[PDB]
Amino acid sequence: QSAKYHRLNLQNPAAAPFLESYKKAITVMLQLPPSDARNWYRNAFIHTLDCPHGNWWFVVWHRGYTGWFERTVRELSGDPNFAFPYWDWTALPQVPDSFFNGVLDPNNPAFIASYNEFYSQLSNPMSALWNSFSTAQLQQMRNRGFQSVNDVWQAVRDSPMFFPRGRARTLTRQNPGFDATTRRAVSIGTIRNALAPTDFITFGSGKTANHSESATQGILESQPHNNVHNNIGGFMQDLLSPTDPVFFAHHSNIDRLWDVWTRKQQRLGLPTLPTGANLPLWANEPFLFFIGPDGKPVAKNKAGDYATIGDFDYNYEPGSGEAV
Amino acid sequence: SAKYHRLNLQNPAAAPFLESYKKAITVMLQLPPSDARNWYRNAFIHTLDCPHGNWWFVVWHRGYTGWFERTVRELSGDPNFAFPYWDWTALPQVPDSFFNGVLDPNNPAFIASYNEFYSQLSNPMSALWNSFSTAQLQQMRNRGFQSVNDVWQAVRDSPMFFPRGRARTLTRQNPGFDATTRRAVSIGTIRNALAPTDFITFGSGKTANHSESATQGILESQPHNNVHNNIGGFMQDLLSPTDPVFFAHHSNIDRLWDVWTRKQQRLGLPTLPTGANLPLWANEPFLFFIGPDGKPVAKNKAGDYATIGDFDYNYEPGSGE
Ligand SMILES: [Cu+2]
Ligand SMILES: [Cu+2]
Ligand SMILES: [Cu+2]
Ligand SMILES: [Cu+2]
């Protein structure tokens, strides 16, 4: 409800200055040395190393990642009111024309142009990062199948996760629209189906032992989230997706739909989180890789710490699905 | 080892089965709707009882496809008939063969409008409703149906029925899947769909009854759901079996279940839900299937359809083997 910061619809004319502030922060982070954890690519690699896909940690990990990166964009933009505008793809089933302007477009020549240059710039920092990992961080890497930083590079190079200049997205300014399947995935009918569940797991995707495992998926993850990623193409179709600035507009919308669901559950007098014995299993999952606006590792390193918007202190301009 | 063989619909040896299928469709469109093997009576089994978004997905569909295969076998007069499968991984488009004659639900042999559909099916479906057992009425209540008119409300208002010219969105000239659906049927997605080593992760989430929604496995959420929706018209809603291609689609889904089961057996891992989950899954009532004699079937729990069993078919191997 009452909050200091406001995540606006990116089509809101009042959001236009925040998109300029975002451009300023991207330009800064592309120009930070990759020894700085707020370097644009260092930021993307948090997602490669730690993001949950296909499990009940999906919305809560993304709340933490987006909430920390918002503070970093706020700091480096010099815009003390900054909050991430959301992409309401239900209203706008296309890459926003605004995200083809300047450094919101990852084809912009300010971005690293090739895998060769990316590895040249990021290999020494990522090796130094690996060598600094705690016992607990190396266990998370083992859970994810990474025995060394070169396992991370194998997945980047071979997937591929990095896309060269001209291929940073499949969708273009001239042809920005979703295909029929992705239009149905973001449709108001699908959004209502996504919000309909009355238990956290059915809403938020399946229970697993650790957040690097795959389980069954909820509608929110499997339809609008996954199909928007894949339809955009390029970085957005794989685990270096936060290289594309539109990633945070996408996740601002996902987090808004979580906020909608939570308030709907509260209205029905139903639980807002996993219940009984599931709650501590879900809350105690280690999230060990988030970076604050000072470039330092964050203290709050359990999933449970990110269950509520809490100290991130934002709310949303209401968007698609609010009336549920 | 099996008596019947579900072939790839691109196999030259499947071409006679596509003609037999056309003959059975023509017959079932011309059966009175008092006959439970009438084409529309058959589609309504799916509207009344199909699970979507839970662990009963593959097993209910095995039962429905297996019974309807026997009905097509009987009414075609082809004693070797088995449903050819649509390997959309190999053929990411509506097969050109499914735009020929009554394989195309735009064919004028089909009922052309909702008004005629209701006129033909309302009295039979009302008589059917009034014949339901306490147990069948409980399944209807689980699904939110207190009356046959709740079923018609869902048909009319969704809508589930599509008029002549709109029976599919994809056409003979433009039969191809969009980029998202091509990815959903891609070999990479098929391998991901087969990768799970537990039934629930493979076959979608546990629920208390089969009319409830849960989390979904890759098999259901990507290739199954996206092919339905990309085709459009009948295939995007719960009168989907009105489109003959429904059974070619479900022959491929059932093949991928067979592939998964044999992969599990090779790894020495479970082929079904385990422990306390197994009886919950096996004992779910499936009370609406119709035999090739037009009679209600005796095998009326999910557990009866866990194996191919006396349906007695195997597959020509396809994508993901
Ligand atoms: Cu992610
Ligand atoms: Cu994402
Ligand atoms: Cu179905
Ligand atoms: Cu289906």
Numbering used by the authors:
A (entry chain A): 34 to 357
B (entry chain B): 35 to 355
What does the paper say about this structure?
Tyrosinases (EC.1.14.18.1) are bifunctional metalloenzymes catalyzing two sequential enzymatic reactions: hydroxylation of monophenols to o-diphenols (monophenolase activity) and oxidation of o-diphenols to the corresponding o-quinones (diphenolase or catecholase activity). The tyrosinase from the bacterium Verrucomicrobium spinosum (vsTyr) is produced as a pre-pro-enzyme in which a C-terminal extension serves as an inactivation domain. It does not require a caddie protein for copper ion incorporation, which makes it similar to eukaryotic tyrosinases. To gain an understanding of the catalytic machinery and regulation of vsTyr activity, we determined the structure of the catalytically active “core domain” of vsTyr by X-ray crystallography.
Crystals of the vsTyr core domain belong to the space group C2 containing two monomers per asymmetric unit. Despite reconstitution with CuSO4 after its purification, the initial crystal structure, determined by molecular replacement at 1.43 Å resolution, revealed that the copper sites were only partially occupied. Using the anomalous contribution of the Cu ions, occupancies of the CuA and CuB sites for the two copies of vsTyr per asymmetric unit could be estimated to be ~40% and ~80%, respectively. The lower occupancy observed for the A site may be caused by its proximity to His86, which belongs to a flexible loop. For vsTyr, the distances of 3.7 Å and 4.0 Å observed in the structures determined from unsoaked and CuSO4-presoaked crystals, respectively, fall within the 3.2–4.0 Å range that is characteristic for the met form. Interestingly, the increased metal site occupancy is the only noticeable difference between the two vsTyr core domain structures reported here. Their superposition results in a very low RMSD of 0.4 Å and identical crystal packing, hinting at the remarkable structural stability of the vsTyr core domain. The final models contain all amino acids of the crystallized construct, except for the C-terminal two (unsoaked) and three amino acids (soaked) in chains B, respectively.
